[PDB]
RNA sequence: GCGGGGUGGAGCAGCCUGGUAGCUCGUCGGGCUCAUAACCCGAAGGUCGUCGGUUCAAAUCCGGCCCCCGCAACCA
RNA sequence: AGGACCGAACCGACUAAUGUUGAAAAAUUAGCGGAUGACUUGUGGCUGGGGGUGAAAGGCCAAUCAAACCGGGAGAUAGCU
RNA sequence: GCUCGCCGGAAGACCAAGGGUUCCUGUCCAACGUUAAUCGGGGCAGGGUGAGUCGACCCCUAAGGCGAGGCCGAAAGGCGUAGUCGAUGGGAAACAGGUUAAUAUUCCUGUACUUGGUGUUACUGCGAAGGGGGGACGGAGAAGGCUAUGUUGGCCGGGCGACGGUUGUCCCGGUUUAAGCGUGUAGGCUGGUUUUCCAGGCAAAUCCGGAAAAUCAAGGCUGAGGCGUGAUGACGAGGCACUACGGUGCUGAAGCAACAAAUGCCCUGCUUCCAGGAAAAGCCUCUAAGCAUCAGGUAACAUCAAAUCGUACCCCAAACCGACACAGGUGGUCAGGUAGAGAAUACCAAGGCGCUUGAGAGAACUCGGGUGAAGGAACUAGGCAAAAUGGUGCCGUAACUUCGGGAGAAGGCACGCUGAUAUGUAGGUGAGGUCCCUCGCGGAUGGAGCUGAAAUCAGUCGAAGAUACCAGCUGGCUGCAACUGUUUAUUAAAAACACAGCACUGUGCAAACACGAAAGUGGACGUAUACGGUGUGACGCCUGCCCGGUGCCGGAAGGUUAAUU
RNA sequence: AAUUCCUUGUCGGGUAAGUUCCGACCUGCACGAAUGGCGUAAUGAUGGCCAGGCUGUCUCCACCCGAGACUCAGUGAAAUU
RNA sequence: AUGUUCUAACGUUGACCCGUAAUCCGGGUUGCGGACAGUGUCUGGUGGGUAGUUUGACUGGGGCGGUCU
């Protein structure tokens, strides 16, 4: 059966890139909070 | 003219057709076209704003002039072609100095008729004139309700308006819908009826009819439940309030006009 | 289980708010008509479902009984 | 010609049996319906939570829906176990 | 290695999306692998992806996104103009053969092509942020003409058979060749050409539009295929020599014709219909300011350049999405034989596989099948399930009907093979010859060969000839919904929803209405034959009484009544 | 009657026998005219009922072919307590 | 307090010019409306469109009936 994840890369970094987190700031504190966290990886930008 | 489908499958039994053959057969006149893509029915916020508009044929918008304002220089109806945008047909003109247009085509023009605009124009279908100029009694369409701002009123299938009267700077008219109202003299008409009057005769026959227009199905409030609608709800076919809009307004009768900057050119409402 | 009603021959008031029975039709007697109906004039006819209670006094107020209407009679 | 007919691909899901710590958190097998259309499908886009979207079933909105998910108010409150 | 079985419109091949070294070699077998493992998509190490032409990038835009100023909003922000982004669409150019363990239209061999720079020559009106053309567009249908492709003959090379027969009317194999460049064909479309004018194309224009005149009739445009060349080449059975016996080396015949034939191509065609079918650039042309012996244009030669990034491998899957080496899901392309209407179905080709526990046995019972005496729905909530029906041609066919239907109604009959008609017919296709011409890829004639139904008559075999696979059960009465459609992803597919039709009612355009503190936007580039709401639900015959209640509509004297004062 | 309680109403049909079905009747607990009335050809994986064919559905099971179950070697669970 | 008339506030989702290569916006000219419309504060009406909540106990189970000083 079709199940929820069908992967498109082009999708994943226009709805989740770095790009996209940097145009709004909402987008902007979500950077802000996981550099605060410390992520290794801030975005799904690869 | 009028046609009725044979009964050859069930969704052509009731399917009548209007059926013009002096329309042009070919491809409309490039240069007067421009791409008209569809909405849904969605604002800019993306939102439904009119329910039931979706799909339907792809459409061309054709560039009519409503403003009838190239004066004093005759033109020749080169032929009459179907418009997807509206109920009228429409004339592609050719003017003397070689500009060609396209207008709504009255009743009764046919290709090589020969029509004016201005105020010296003679009184004859497709001539267009100031209403100061205009006979009063005269029935007349694409009527302009500001001076120079193009026609507005009576440009459906088969409509027309008659000016019932001349007093001073306006002429009253009554229009299709029964009002009685006052427009300015200096504003322009177009003498005659809108064309293609058998519109109305037409039967869709079948659902899908409707959806080629771009048309998507109503569903009634009363089938629905109380969350979507005031009617929703029942066990059974229920019922038992007062008929109201989706957003709760009575429909059935009461009035929503609310203008008190265009009350004064009423003169009699509908009735 | 809960409301309601039993009043001249018929249908219906009067109950609440104790003392007092009305209305229309029917009945009967006289008229009018050749007669009948119509119509006119004069009358008679319900102690009020039954049984008790209460009261100076009960259609009336209270209770039983009988009869006739409703409604209710449910969830596993 | 046709929301025509019969029938593969394709789309669907009417019946039965199997399965039910499954091969599978919805399938398989045998039959079944539509199959030029209100058809089907790829790629991108738009609509956001009392909000959307709904040929209307309270359907659907990431295996979640009579009000999503996540984080916070927060050690809510619990005459109850 | 030999046999056997399985797929073959796939269980073969090539991609995209996704993944990311899974690719190839050596080595190892602890863990991983539902068993063992010497094996592996496992561990370790090394190797492997080569482009002016393929793709991206790049140029151009769609839906949409962002958005200078702007408009709006407590703030955050919203909306939008000029712009600028955004493919799933438009835009230059390459093919055949050979090669690696692992890449190839990329390497090599042969033969091409495209766009730009720069220079020498010869001419010469060039010039855009503007005008015009073009790009540039639907559905269905019907053919003709072709080709891919196949079949058979001929030709060439091999064979003459494990068991009766087999030098033939016999058996096996091969019979292949591109882009490009020349030709301009079947066919499609279109009158040319020259002068004069001119309220048009934001200004001009010689361009386009229009008008009036000559002149003449073939001008032009587009176009599959074929043919020629490319190619004295490439490839080629098979033989021969090595061998590291895996493979390398060497050589090399024939290489034709007829017929059949796509769902491909001509064809973005043509015919027809109504629901009326993107945009922008490249491209062609016109001029404005400007520039003018300068640029610029065009031609011909000559050179130079064509960067960067992707390129392994899987890809209906053990590599992707499903926690699994998971009976699930996943877009595009290719399309051999026989039988067949067929991309169904059966058996096969090329190609690929036997599904990563086996060995025995032959209990009950469970699962999936086969057959069944006599009966024949007695079973059961219910013929649930199974059984049965099934093809093509012909004959034949009821009520009722909206005249279409019902209808494949029902029911029936024929059907294999062999011969004859006719050593292969009707048809289709058409060589040579014979002629004719505005001599071509031409016409007419002509019929050689090739292909080939269908029927009748006569025989003949079997229990049975639509022999398998495949492939309707049928009729009668009745409720409901007119119909096709839609629906509770995952217990309900329906009588529910929708629907064409009907009616009521709002709405005069800055429409009502909806989304939005707003600006705006949808409605609609629509205008009352239009739009919105509500009910009803094809069609036929119709749709009676009640305005007291409760809504709505109208009125507006009187009473009552707010802020205010 | 998708509506009717009483109710398996009553009468007729069909069956040996019919609480279902079909046709009547009218006594409509509690039908009824666009929350439409009554018809209706065609349509339907729609509800009821009847027949022909056909049968392992059944009287009433029998036998066979395969995959398990059973034994052997290897690997190696689970709920529960 | 009505009625008219006016223009000069204000409106314009008329036309035309300009910024400007621009259907935005603004400025200009004109036309048409015009002290109306519309907006702010105050105020009466309406208002399941929306929100927050209430809707007793006893009871030979609960409801229903009855009760409650
Ligand atoms: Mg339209
Ligand atoms: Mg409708
Ligand atoms: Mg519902
Ligand atoms: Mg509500
Ligand atoms: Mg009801
Ligand atoms: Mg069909
Ligand atoms: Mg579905
Ligand atoms: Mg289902
Ligand atoms: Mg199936
Ligand atoms: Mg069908
Ligand atoms: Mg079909
Ligand atoms: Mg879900
Ligand atoms: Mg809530
Ligand atoms: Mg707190
Ligand atoms: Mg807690
Ligand atoms: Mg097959
Ligand atoms: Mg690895
Ligand atoms: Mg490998
Ligand atoms: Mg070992
Ligand atoms: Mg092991
Ligand atoms: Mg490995
Ligand atoms: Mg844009
Ligand atoms: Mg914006
Ligand atoms: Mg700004
Ligand atoms: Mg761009
Ligand atoms: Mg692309
Ligand atoms: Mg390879
Ligand atoms: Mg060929
Ligand atoms: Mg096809
Ligand atoms: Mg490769
Ligand atoms: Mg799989
Ligand atoms: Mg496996
Ligand atoms: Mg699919
Ligand atoms: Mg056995
Ligand atoms: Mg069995
Ligand atoms: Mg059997
Ligand atoms: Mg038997
Ligand atoms: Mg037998
Ligand atoms: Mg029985
Ligand atoms: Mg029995
Ligand atoms: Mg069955
Ligand atoms: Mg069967
Ligand atoms: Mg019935
Ligand atoms: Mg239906
Ligand atoms: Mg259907
Ligand atoms: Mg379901
Ligand atoms: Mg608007
Ligand atoms: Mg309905
Ligand atoms: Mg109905
Ligand atoms: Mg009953
Ligand atoms: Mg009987
Ligand atoms: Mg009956
Ligand atoms: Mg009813
Ligand atoms: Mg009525
Ligand atoms: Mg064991
Ligand atoms: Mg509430
Ligand atoms: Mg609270
Ligand atoms: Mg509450
Ligand atoms: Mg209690």
Redesign the pocket.
């Known amino acids: ?12 970094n ?2 989740h890139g770095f790009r996209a987190r940097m ?4 987008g902007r504190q979500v950077l802000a909070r996981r550099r605060a966290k410390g992520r290794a990886r801030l975005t799904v930008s ?1 | 003219a009028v ?1 009725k ?16 053959p002096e ?6 006149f ?2 007067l ?32 002039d ?2 009838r ?2 004066d ?3 033109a ?1 109806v080169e032929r009459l ?8 047909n429409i004339a592609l003109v ?7 247009r396209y207008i ?1 085509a009255p009743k009764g023009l046919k290709a090589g008729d020969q029509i004016q605009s201005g105020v010296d124009a003679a009184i004859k279908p497709g001539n267009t004139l100031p209403m100061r100029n205009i006979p009063v009694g005269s029935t007349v ?1 694409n009527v ?16 027309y ?1 008659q000016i019932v009267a001349r007093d001073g ?2 002429v009253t008219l009554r ?5 009685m ?1 006052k427009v ?1 003299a ?1 504003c322009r008409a177009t003498l005659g ?2 064309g ?37 709800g ?1 066990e059974g ?4 309030k ?25 003169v009699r ?2 009735s």
């Open positions: 059966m079709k199940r929820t994840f069908q992967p498109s890369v082009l999708k994943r226009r709805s145009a709004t700031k909402n690869k | 046609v489908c044979k009964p050859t499958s069930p969704g052509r039994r009731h399917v009548v057709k209007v059926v013009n329309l042009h057969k070919g491809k409309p490039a240069p076209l421009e791409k008209n893509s569809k909405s849904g029915g969605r604002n800019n916020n993306g939102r439904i704003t009119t329910r039931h508009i979706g799909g339907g044929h792809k459409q061309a918008y054709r560039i009519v409503f403003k304002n190239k004093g220089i005759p020749v072609e179907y418009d997807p945008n509206r109920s009228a050719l003017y003397k100095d070689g500009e060609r709504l369409h302009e309700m500001k001076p120079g701002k193009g026609g507005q009123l009576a440009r459906s299938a088969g409509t308006v700077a306006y229009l299709r819908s029964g009002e109202r300015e200096d009826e809108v293609n009057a058998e519109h109305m005769l037409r039967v869709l026959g079948k659902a899908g009819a409707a959806r080629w227009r771009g048309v998507r199905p109503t569903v009634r409030g009363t089938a629905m439940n109380p969350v979507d609608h005031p009617h929703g029942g076919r229920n019922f038992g007062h008929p109201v809009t989706p957003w709760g307004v009575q429909t059935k009768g009461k009035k929503t006009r609310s203008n008190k900057r265009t009350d004064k050119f009423i409402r509908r």
